[PDB]
Amino acid sequence: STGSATTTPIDSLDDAYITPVQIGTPAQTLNLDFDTGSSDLWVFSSETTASEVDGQTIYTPSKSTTAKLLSGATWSISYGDGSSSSGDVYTDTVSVGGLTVTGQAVESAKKVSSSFTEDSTIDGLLGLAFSTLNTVSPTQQKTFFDNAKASLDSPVFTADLGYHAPGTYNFGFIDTTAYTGSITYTAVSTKQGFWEWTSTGYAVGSGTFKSTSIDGIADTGTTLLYLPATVVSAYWAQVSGAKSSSSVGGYVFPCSATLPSFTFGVGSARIVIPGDYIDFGPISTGSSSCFGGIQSSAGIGINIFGDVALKAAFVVFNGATTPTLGFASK
Ligand SMILES: Cc1ccc2c(n1)N(C)[C@H](CO)CCNC2
């Protein structure tokens, strides 16, 4: 089997991407944030505290004839930015772009933190990291990908995120029309439960390539590119007036600037992030200070190849018994 679904930026800055997902019988369609940095499929639901729902589409398990309470199971998750959610668990039928999983754990939110409430366009998250990170207790549950894997033509999914435009998540096949040149594959470590790999280095603009190992994770659920302070300082040093602001919480730059590209290494291959991809606009409405799309990972504990990096590539998440990651230009 295979599946193919379009993913769409939630706003004009590509702060996140939502993908339609069918849950239950008859189908209830929710727009989920596909997140290769976590492993929980959770949704706003009829069980979510009323004051914490503001515009989201909710899942109502009582209206699904295939919904079954997973008796005794609870879940509780906190993400890298301090946001969180928790609740109980149903199993139900879940379909993504024509690909159907029966008995998928659908984690029903009883509580969500403010940043989720304030995000009316995101109805939930669909985790695509390794199932070892799934927070369901006392019986850990499998991701949508993990459950579909054996049925897929090939044990892979691909992320093809658009810049200020829709993109595609495919399951079970590699669309050879979706990229240019060849796909370069690189080793993955699952030891932290992430799609963790090692970049071979970087370049700023038309500058020379610096060979240096940068361990990081491919995370569709993170907006920006977070890299070591050395690398990030080298980038912003090429933008006149750019500076790190503690009050704003990262590098900002004059909105009148033209940003340089940023290149990262994948083995001997190179992925080029155009400068415009690194512009996240005025820090506040009407401001002439703009927020940068490349930031320091120093306060995180891990480097994160988020959407800013990933949207510049066609990315293969290969879930064979020895997982690997593939990157192609497009
Ligand atoms: C993957 C994920 C986790 C938590 C959150 C999230 N995404 N949202 C939608 C955005 C992402 O920039 C930030 C707000 N914190 C909640």
HEC profile for 90-118?
Answer: EEEEEEECCEEEEEEEEEEEEEECHHHHC
How many domains does the chain divide into?
2
List C-alpha distances in Å: 47 to 50, 60, 87, 90, 92: 8, 8, 8, 12, 16
CA dihedral for 254, 297, 197, 218, sign (positive or negative) = negative
**Experimental technique behind these coordinates:** X-ray
Stated as kind and residue range, the H or E segment containing 124 is strand 124-127
Mutation choice for ligand 1 from 7, 31, 119, 308, CB with most ligand atoms inside 8 A: 119
Domain identity same for 89 and 185 = no
Of 134, 150, 174, which residue sits at a domain end?
A: 174
**Any atom of ligand 1 within 6 Å of the Cβ of 114:** no
Domain identity same for 184 and 142 = no
Q: Could you tell me which residues come within 8 angstroms of residue 107 by beta carbon, excluding any fewer than 6 positions away? A: 40, 41, 42, 43, 75, 87, 88, 89, 136, 141
The alpha carbon of 203 and the centre of ligand 1 are apart by a number of angstroms equal to 28
**Any atom of ligand 1 within 6 Å of the Cβ of 221:** yes
The residue nearest atom 9 of ligand 1, judged by CA position, is: 16
DSSP 271-324: EEE-GGGGEEEESSTT-SEEEESEEE-TTTSSEEE-HHHHTTSEEEEE-SSS-E
State which amino acid sits at residue 184. Answer: T
Q: Read off the DSSP letter of residue 63.
A: G
**Any atom of ligand 1 within 6 Å of the Cβ of 49:** no
Of 156, 174, 192, which residue sits at a domain end?
A: 174
Nearest to 259 by CA among 220, 294, 222, 212: 294
Domain identity same for 88 and 179 = no
The residue nearest atom 3 of ligand 1, judged by CA position, is: 79
The alpha carbon of 221 and the centre of ligand 1 are apart by a number of angstroms equal to 7
Residue 151's domain is classified under what CATH number? 2.40.70.10
Of 116, 147, 174, which residue sits at a domain end?
A: 174
Domain identity same for 160 and 285 = no
**268, exposed or middle or buried, with CB in 10 Å at 0-12, 13-18, 19+?**
exposed
Tell me the pairing of strands 41-43 and 99-112. parallel
Domain identity same for 186 and 168 = no
Alpha helices in the chain (DSSP H): 114-117, 144-148, 229-236, 307-310
Domain identity same for 109 and 150 = yes
Domain identity same for 140 and 179 = no
The alpha carbon of 206 and the centre of ligand 1 are apart by a number of angstroms equal to 33
Q: Could you tell me which residues come within 8 angstroms of residue 154 by beta carbon, excluding any fewer than 6 positions away? A: 172, 173, 174
**Any atom of ligand 1 within 6 Å of the Cβ of 15:** yes
The alpha carbon of 25 and the centre of ligand 1 are apart by a number of angstroms equal to 28
Domain of residue 232, residue span: 175-330
Return the structure tokens found at 148: 């579909």
Classify each residue of 223-241 as buried b or exposed e, where b means 16 or more C-beta atoms within 10 Å of its C-beta. Answer: bbbbbbeebbebbbeebee
The residue nearest atom 5 of ligand 1, judged by CA position, is: 83
The closest-lying atom of ligand 1 relative to the alpha carbon of residue 122 is 9
Domain identity same for 12 and 53 = yes
Domain identity same for 184 and 168 = no
Q: Could you tell me which residues come within 8 angstroms of residue 103 by beta carbon, excluding any fewer than 6 positions away? A: 91, 92, 93, 147
Domain identity same for 9 and 148 = yes
Strand partners, 208: none
Domain identity same for 56 and 150 = yes
**Any atom of ligand 1 within 6 Å of the Cβ of 35:** yes
Catalytic residues: 35, 199
Domain identity same for 326 and 225 = yes
The alpha carbon of 24 and the centre of ligand 1 are apart by a number of angstroms equal to 25
The alpha carbon of 177 and the centre of ligand 1 are apart by a number of angstroms equal to 31
List C-alpha distances in Å: 60 to 28, 142, 153, 251, 283: 8, 21, 32, 42, 37
The closest-lying atom of ligand 1 relative to the alpha carbon of residue 82 is 15
Q: Could you tell me which residues come within 8 angstroms of residue 50 by beta carbon, excluding any fewer than 6 positions away? A: none
Rounded distance between C-alpha atoms, residue 276 and residue 293, angstroms: 9
